[model samples]
Target: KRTMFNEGFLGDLHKVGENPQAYPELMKEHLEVTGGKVRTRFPPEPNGYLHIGHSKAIMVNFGYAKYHNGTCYLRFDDTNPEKEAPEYFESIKRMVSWLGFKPWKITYSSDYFDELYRLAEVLIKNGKAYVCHCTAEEIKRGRGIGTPGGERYACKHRDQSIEQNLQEFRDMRDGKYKPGEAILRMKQDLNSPSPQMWDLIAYRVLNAPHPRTGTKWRIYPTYDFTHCLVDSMENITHSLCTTEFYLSRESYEWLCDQVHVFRPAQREYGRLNITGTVLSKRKIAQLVDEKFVRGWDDPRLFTLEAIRRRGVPPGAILSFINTLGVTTSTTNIQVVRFESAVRKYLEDTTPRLMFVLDPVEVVVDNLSDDYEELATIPYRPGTPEFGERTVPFTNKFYIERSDFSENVDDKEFFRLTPNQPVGLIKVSHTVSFKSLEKDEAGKIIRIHVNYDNKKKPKTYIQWVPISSKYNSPLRVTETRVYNQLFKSENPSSHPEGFLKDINPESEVVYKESVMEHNFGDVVKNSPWVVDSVKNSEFYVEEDKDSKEVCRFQAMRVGYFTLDKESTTSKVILNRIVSLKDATSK
Candidate 1:
């Protein structure tokens, strides 16, 4: 049973616990809660790429550790080489760091392959494990449904001598048997009160080559076998995982006792569920694989990258998380609440810029021709630090096309009709629609208004010079406005396919529209501006007017602000919850 045993091979039980080190008072409190041990790790599986659900895990693991003055580790659970990819390992590292976290140590489950083997051998010597070759379906059937009983079936290989089992394990490693023909299983109760107590596979043969160790291992340890042993070898104090694995705690503790190693405590937290979105990794992958969604960062997807790419600010994300707080309740939050928070963030941080989404030409007659050529408009009315920007005030200009209407209904407040008069903003008097120009099919080309100071309306409307240097004005190539990604408040309740129930019109892209010349400075100068002017350096240099809390507001147009990957030329403006009640529309 004991094959070539070395006295020095046995690890000290005391050494299996946490290392003695103080991170600071921050992490000190964390250790106190866990009886003096650090809480740290962002363990990602190198299967498919990471998703938004993983972000909450990373934030909790890394954020808690860092907040408490402890170190966090980025560990890859790459035991199953068949599914793990080297590229995934590298990508996980980049995503974690992007979220403002760095691993104290980059580790892998494969690093404990030798130790895990030794522990498995010790279990066999103690008669606590045996080899089993059962069909996957048969094994599932053995653990019968809705009852505390596994089928009373015994494997002929379960009674093999320890030496014979050990030799067969070696044969499994030597490629003597095909995968599924043989598997090393823990010798637990077959008819125990708890169904989980049934003999579970400890290791199985997989002929596929590995990313790091290539065909070096034909029989790889299962998650149950590797998880506990790996934790013991690395001296991990508290193994924090989501509640989905709460049942596996028994197997986790059993392995530690089988090897007589100090058992690291396992704590399970409630699963994180974001409202109006499905967080299932398998489901999200389906959406990406089938191209139901644009990509991971699609504006409609709830992925942080997609949201960030859609111009979401980091502060907005932090605020959303902060508002959620740490809780166990499954309270469904509204999509508008999240959007409203983002909107407030932009409003407080962005600089003003004039934008007319849909344009219609208007001419003001009561203006000084020379002075109308150019005029200085204070960039921000009350802010002196930003100073002013110039706007060309010409006789002919454009306003939002919808701002004018043929129906002079009681509900209408702005724009001029055939007889009604309205003031032109900044540079003029009242103007009445003298006549209307129509195209061949009879759609109004332009509302011809006559300028007169005789009867100016109380309200004024915004306009821009048609003769500015930036011709074919700065039209946004694509203006994609977004709505809630899902139709239901509790999207989790949806049947089989969550994607099928997804709101189809969550995003609307504006094909083309022009902006004024000074639009650049106003958009670029506001909030955390990063532009080509800085050469190639990308830094967060806060605007003097923006609050440290993160806020931005674009004038005339919808409210918007800077986000990650924002630069002068490629300004990705996220429309925080729009001003739903538009007085200027």
Candidate 2:
């Protein structure tokens, strides 16, 4: 069969090489001969918010379905109730929508509980399944040890009659058994070379109430038993999953044949791994439960909610995944590659605004009280369709504190140093440093400068005006700068632990930063980009609903969004990422 990989699919998809050797023969034959319609599904356990790893699967399933003019289903593997919550369910659905894919249908494993229960009875009555009361440790030990002489042995209850097994299973469903007291096991080959073929647990006694079913179900099907059965019932043409499940394909098919049901073809692909962070849900949950982070949506996390809150547009994410492409060989994507894609996607689209962080008062010594200039700045330079904003410039204004230095020869600096003139960005004027006022702390209280309206300097610095008697000035807002969450590129590689490698300076907060009044209007509306140093731009997206602060980008500072804790009286912004790599600096 000529698969997409064999057809020279571009990018990494072609690099996946040939079809997986383990690909089921029936499915391959069906695909080649029948030219049947394709049907795929994205099934996720609703125990936590979807992460970046899930993004790959989402794109593949949804993209393939659309590419083939078929259908894709969003199914919740909500069989585990101990850790499941309605919050996770709602979040999963919201994230799917936010990613721009509409599911042909939404389903749940629990929705077919009755049918699965009936199928389990069929297996028990047919002597292909049995109920056991062994502890988890005993089951593991009986699954065969590593020694040459070690061999798997059946549990004492394996010899029980079909009627006895059926009665015990019924008792388990009736809640007569306590949690872990009894479980239904499929009678697969214990002597098989594949460990997945060992008598696997099909159902477990869990006394916990399910988020959807409440207290109605005490016995729930294990992933092994439920995954295949649900796919068969839903008529899934392709049951896609990560490579870790390749060994389970045999058992999945075995269970379906035992129940006399239509078996879906199972396919496996390499899982997405990103450097710098661990994708394990258990570890991520620990970070949330242990307060290692603010929550799942914390900017430090890669959770979909967190990514969206950090202002990564959905299209950028889709583009990033598409570039990575579909593959059966494992690949590790660097965080910088993903960030670069996002920056490229946004560079030409967003509007530009001037924002000044670390504001320092600058007084023009040469201008009179009547001195004033209204500068018209394009929101997006060279693109007038995005419109423009006006800035009021007076003798008194604020510039970045770093742009001025009291000592000239002390360091190799080009900005507003003593005797050297520096142009003001967008104002078309040059300013020469005169002197700086210092308070008791020896910090510069104000900078004195003389304006040059004729001669232009080679270098320019950004500024925001202070309110004059004639015009209103810019407003000050709190700004937070975010660095990488981990000090090391691979935080999980740390011997001490991933948590021990947490960057102490992950977030830095600065208050009293000012921006042009027009910038605030853009913050209230749509995302706006700002011109920073080195000819780069920051895409500032709004977080109007956040209670902490108004979100916007500070040119030459970093990407920022509003904080939820901000109130109307005080505006706070959270830095999503710096214009460059903070770790290298």
Candidate 3:
């Protein structure tokens, strides 16, 4: 009935549902109901937000289901029910949809509690599983250090009669035992080398209120029991998981056989780990608790929400996955390589508009205060599908302070110099440097330029208009630029560990920058998010109606998105990625 068992294994006591062939009628019905097609599931624990690694999980599970014309369930593996929250459940669904996956049906691990408990009864009645009163430490001491074939002695309760085991199991269900006071463990081969075969914990008393079930159960099943049983109940054809579960696949099939249920085949895929940031939930938890970073959704984090807020579109993540073919090779990809993929995706998808990060007032001496023109430009220069947006150009505008110089000696100089006349982006005329208003230390506070309608320079620069008539410049409250959170390539591998490799200059905030004037329209259009973003955690909240977050190419700057913190009074922008691989350069 049970495969992957040692020759001396004696756990399959009654051989009731010991093998898939043992339940022919059930298998036939399962085949008929499943249409003999592939069925997979994305079973995520509803405790924490999913990071970039989960994207690969969703891609493999739901992605494989879609590829085979099979069904995939977004099953919440909410077994412990301690850290589980409803927000996590909601966010998982939102992210799955955001990644362009529509689950066939959303289910939860708690949904099968009744069936799982009854199956546990089946195991207990058959003497395949027994409840042990051993303390947590006692169980560990009994298991021993399993490497190099150490002795794994069975607990005294292992020899208890099935009647006594049933009574203990029933008592555990009846709320007679406190957590750790009693645990129902699978009766497996003690002589087996894998610790997974050494009587894994099946159920424990967790008196916590389940997010969904809510105090209905005094005891909860562990992943060892829940994962396989649920997979069998749902008739999963391929139980896919990361390589870490490779050893546990033995226990996974063992549980299904002991319960006389349909067993799914388990396959291990390699984990996708990026070079710079840590992906483990517990590692990030340490970062959060230790104040290594702000929170899970911090832009430096590879969390989907941060990726969403950072202006990396959902499709871009999928495209990144596309570059890495699904295999069992653990990928420790360079973060730079990941950014390059994002840069490639955003360049064509996002529309362009001029924005000035560092502003120096440029005055066109030939043009009056009354002079203004509506410059219409396509969102993308090469692509017409993006259409056009109109922005106002006024006599007074702002350019980057670095673009101007007093000496015009350099013949190649095309920017605002004493002799050179530089063209304005999307504007008809050129501006020649005339005079400068200097502050202390000879710094040009304001540079006056003569408008030369006939002469155009080789270089054009991005600028924001200052006129109040058009609200030409949307003054940004803050714009954030992020460097690698850690100085080390593999932060976790640092001698001082990942925390000490924290880059102090990781985040650079620029408060005085001004962005595309038309962005005001984006703010005005999505007026609902002003309250919606504040109403609930944007990381978890899914406003199906207001799905669009304001994202666009900031011309010379990279792609930017309006942060959730933006109010009607103030705006914040986060750089998604630069126009190119400016980080490496």
Best by lDDT: 3
Give the alpha carbon lDDT tens digit for every residue of 375-479 in model 3: 898766766545678877888889988678777687656677887778889888788877889888887789888877754487898888887877767788888
Candidate 2 local lDDT, 529-560, one digit each (tens): 33331132112233334332233445666666
The RMSD (Cα, Å) of candidate 2 is 5.6
Q: lDDT of candidate 1?
A: 0.63
Question: Which portions of model 2 miss their true places by more than 4 Å?
Answer: 1-38, 133-138, 146-149, 155-164, 175-181, 278-292, 454-456, 467-473, 524-553, 565-569, 582-584
lDDT of 3 at 207: 81
What is candidate 2's TM-score against the reference? 0.85
Model 1 earns a TM-score of 0.77
The whole-model C-alpha lDDT of candidate 2 against the native structure comes to 0.73
TM-score of each: 0.77, 0.85, 0.85
